[PDB]
Design a protein around this nucleic acid. Structure first.
Lengths: 274, 44, 87
RNA sequence: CUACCCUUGGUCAGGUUGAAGUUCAGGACUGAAUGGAGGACCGAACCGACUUACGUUGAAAAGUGAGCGGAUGAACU
RNA sequence: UGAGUAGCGAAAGACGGGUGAGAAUCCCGUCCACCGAUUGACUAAGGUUUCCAGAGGAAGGCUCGUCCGCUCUGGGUUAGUCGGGUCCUAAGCUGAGGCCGACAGGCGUAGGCGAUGGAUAACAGGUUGAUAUUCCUGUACCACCUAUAAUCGUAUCGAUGGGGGGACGCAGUAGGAUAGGCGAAGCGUGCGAUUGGAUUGCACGUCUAAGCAGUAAGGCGCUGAGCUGUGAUGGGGAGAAGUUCGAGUCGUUGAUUUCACACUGCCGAGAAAAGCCUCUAGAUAGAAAAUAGGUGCCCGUACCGCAAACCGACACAGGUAGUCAAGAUGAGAAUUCUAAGGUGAGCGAGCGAACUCUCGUUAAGGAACUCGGCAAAAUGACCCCGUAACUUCGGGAGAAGGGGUGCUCUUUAGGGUUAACGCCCAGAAGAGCCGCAGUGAAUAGGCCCAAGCGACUGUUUAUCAAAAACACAGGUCUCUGCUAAACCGUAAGGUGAUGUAUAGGGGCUGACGCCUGCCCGGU
RNA sequence: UGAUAUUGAAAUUGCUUUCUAACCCGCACCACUUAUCGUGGUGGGAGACAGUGUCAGGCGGGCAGUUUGA
């Protein structure tokens, strides 16, 4: 689980850290990495479009496969490993005929698993099969949207979605957020839940440990001058002073919807987040 | 105290050089304008 | 060929090592292999080695008027057999 | 130059303390070894600029003296 | 004019002998003084001839000048191996077709460029006024070519392709060797004049790359490995002696250097491509053993480089990356004094007025001064004892508060290395000696009792504000189902994110503890 | 947010619903091509909607030009 720290100083006082009894290896397989240069929210114009990024630690992009597209060629989960750029831990599966790949290691796997095109494999943790085969009530993760691109939904740590009823064209899904929406019947999904459930329990403790994951400080609009933020100046500490708290570029930042009004996927949502 | 001009041959020619001027429409206007005036030294 | 310009004779460093090596101001756009060939073709010797050094233009400014001298290649050939005359 | 970022490098005399962890003797927990943690401690380089005197047709369009702060890090370069 | 006035830019100079038309200043010498984790040696950026020699003294040099970083006149830079190119590639830039765009133009794929990184063969000595792994002396190694080659022919050549490898964080130790240092045997020079003495006082105690071996350790009998030992080397250098002779030992200590980002640990999970080794596609038809001879291009190379040569208008107390870094003292690269080595600051001479600046001491008192103990005094190192409230159990805390310290001589365990003696680090205790004072100089915490703010480390107005302001780890509200929301751009195109609701953006509060009451008129 | 052009068929009654060729796909594969660009081809998804053009209404201190007497 997580391990605490005796408060031998200030700064590591109320600080906890994830206890890596799950990471069973300390080196990546060499051939599945790629360089990954940082970008402090700078676009191709060189401008700072997205704030509070930049800095941190070097990374190496583990080439993970979200496709999971094979003939039931079996695999043996050799190693569980650390991925510095996603909340899940990864798993280095070797196929029965000489191939190395990185799966999002779900919770509870050292066994050996099978991509499931049809009614080939079984519903046991680690098998990826279409949504037409997955029976109702399963909690799947790594759900595709468009048939064959790589799963996109339910992909963080400790994330999973329920497979509610179906139609033969669109199986329903209840996402992790309360969203219930339809998904095309031939889009793969992996049985089980994504491990590493402790990831939301960790107190990063000190302001530097937050600053070496790539997060620059976030100033408040109310302590800015009038030309910078709508919450502007004022003598002394002043209240919001407006009928609505505004974002730094002049849009109401509390309670207003930004969901488009003409999207193709509004005939695919049954209920919204709640 | 640290003053504003720290000389650098590479920086000087990569920013104010000839080829950097000729690789633009506006730099070419600058060169044409300095040839028009009669400058002994066109570019930096 | 005529890729030799001027026999350099100086106080010491064109005579104090002149019994074995000869210095010539040469054309400013030539390898040291063309210089080897030109000396073997003009003075009819067999050259052991050859060194080359470029100089800057130095601003001799005389009479209210500025201006640089010329640049120049100073080659220095070391003969194996034979000698160079005229001086 | 200055602000911020990116890619590749470099520098931080010496000393003090002694977390987790483990190892042993007992009996979950104790004690002794071991271990070396930390935007830890003292303190030079280094980087700053709190006080105060001097200077103010200055040595200097922002400095000097004496002290002063951080000095393994959200470091400096 | 102010006015012969302010200044003449941090610092020790003295005398002799010269040169000279002219000397505080220029040269030579002796003494003295200053730096010495640097005022010393070397190099990157930058400058761009300021480098050297002969001549000069109009202007420059904050005075002088016979001098010079100034003037005139002649000279100075040497590379197959050093740094870069004919090798590779990050970031970025550019971009055939392409996408978009009133025009101009923007974005961008294959590609290419682009080191601060990866790969890559040379060392020691000598020499001039000025060069120096470049020239010369000796001994090398790498690439290519020509005539033989021992031995050839599935012998060989392989990719512009597959694979491996290159290939990488941080911290903390222990260790192996070595650089350096230090003390005693061989060396060579001296053996004094002030009392004394000759178990005396000095200075030296060397040497490369490459190639032959073997080798602490390291990872999986294989791979890689600092160092050692032999030659290299009859050589070169060498304190010295008269062109020639000239020693080269032990014992100790030992890095921050190398084995080596090795090994252990940890979490924040730590470049790429090539050279390199292979694999077959495909070429099909030599020699890498060896013998010698030949071949190897372009660019920088001078001088300054903590500075009078760079950036600051100046011969400007400022700024300027890395590199080696000795002795006594010590934890130590601190402090004080010196070494190697280099400098004495480009105005001086008097006299010792008020006043101003920097510094030292002071009777009695001891904050009475004052906006205010501001400033300055005091504490100050190492060892021993002892140490409160409170507390988040970590701390507070070096709390506070005391005591000790110099030298000599006895006696006893000690650590290391070691045949042994011998060195080096260490102590105990006791007997004495001195003084006003014993960490006898330099360096080095003032402490305590309360209260307001902010939890903490951090950041901030380059140049009048460093804080109670900002950040913060934590909290909470809210939008976002992924061509996500938000943002930049008109658009293409991007960031978000090669992420996906334990995620992303935005607003407020600001560790921790106890809580966070009520009203939906209006907006 | 509406009318309209790109913009088609069928049913049932201009509101509705179904289909496929328009249009769209930061979908998959293949070829240019030992390219996450692009173009083309083949499936899938979506489908007359979206997007884009002209017209109109609304919101709009996000930004702009200004007034704020004697």
């Amino acid at each position: 689980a997580i391990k605490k720290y005796k408060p031998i100083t200030n700064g590591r006082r109320n600080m906890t850290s994830l206890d890596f009894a799950e990471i069973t290896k300390t080196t990546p397989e060499k051939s599945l990495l790629k360089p990954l240069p940082k970008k402090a929210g700078r676009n191709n114009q060189g401008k700072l479009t997205v704030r509070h990024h930049g800095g941190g630690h070097k990374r190496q992009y583990r080439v993970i496969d979200f496709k999971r597209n094979k003939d039931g060629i079996n695999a043996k989960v050799d190693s569980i490993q650390y991925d510095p750029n996603r909340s899940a831990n990864i798993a280095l599966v070797v196929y029965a005929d000489g191939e190395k790949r990185y799966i999002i290691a779900p919770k509870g796997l050292e066994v050996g698993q099978i991509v499931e095109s049809g009614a080939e494999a079984d519903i046991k943790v680690g098998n990826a099969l279409p949504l037409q085969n997955i029976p109702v009530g399963t909690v799947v993760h790594n759900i595709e949207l468009k048939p064959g691109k790589g799963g996109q939904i339910a992909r963080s740590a400790g994330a999973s979605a329920q497979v509610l009823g179906k139609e033969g064209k669109y199986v329903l899904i209840r996402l992790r957020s309360g969203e219930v929406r339809m998904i095309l019947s031939t889009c793969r999904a992996t049985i089980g839940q994504v491990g590493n459930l402790q990831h939301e329990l960790v107190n990063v403790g000190k302001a530097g440990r937050s600053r070496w994951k790539g997060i620059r400080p976030t100033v408040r609009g109310s302590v800015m001058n009038p030309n910078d933020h709508p919450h502007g100046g004022g003598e002394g500490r002043a209240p919001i002073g407006r009928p609505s708290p505004m974002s730094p570029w002049g849009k109401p930042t509390l309670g207003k919807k930004t969901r488009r009004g003409k999207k193709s996927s509004d005939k695919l949502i049954v209920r919204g987040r709640k | 105290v640290k003053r504003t001009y720290q000389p650098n041959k590479r920086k000087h020619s990569k920013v104010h050089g000839f080829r950097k001027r000729m690789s633009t429409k506006n730099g070419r206007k600058v060169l044409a304008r300095r040839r028009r005036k009669g400058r002994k030294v066109l570019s930096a | 060929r005529d890729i030799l310009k001027r026999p350099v004779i100086t106080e010491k460093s064109s005579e104090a090592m002149a019994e074995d090596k000869y210095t010539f101001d040469v054309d400013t756009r030539v390898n040291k292999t063309q210089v080897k060939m030109a000396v073997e073709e003009i003075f009819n010797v067999k050259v052991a080695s050859v060194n080359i050094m470029n100089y800057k233009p130095k601003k001799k400014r005389m009479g209210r008027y500025q201006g640089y001298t010329n640049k120049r290649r100073k080659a220095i050939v070391t003969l194996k057999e034979g000698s160079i005359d005229l001086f």
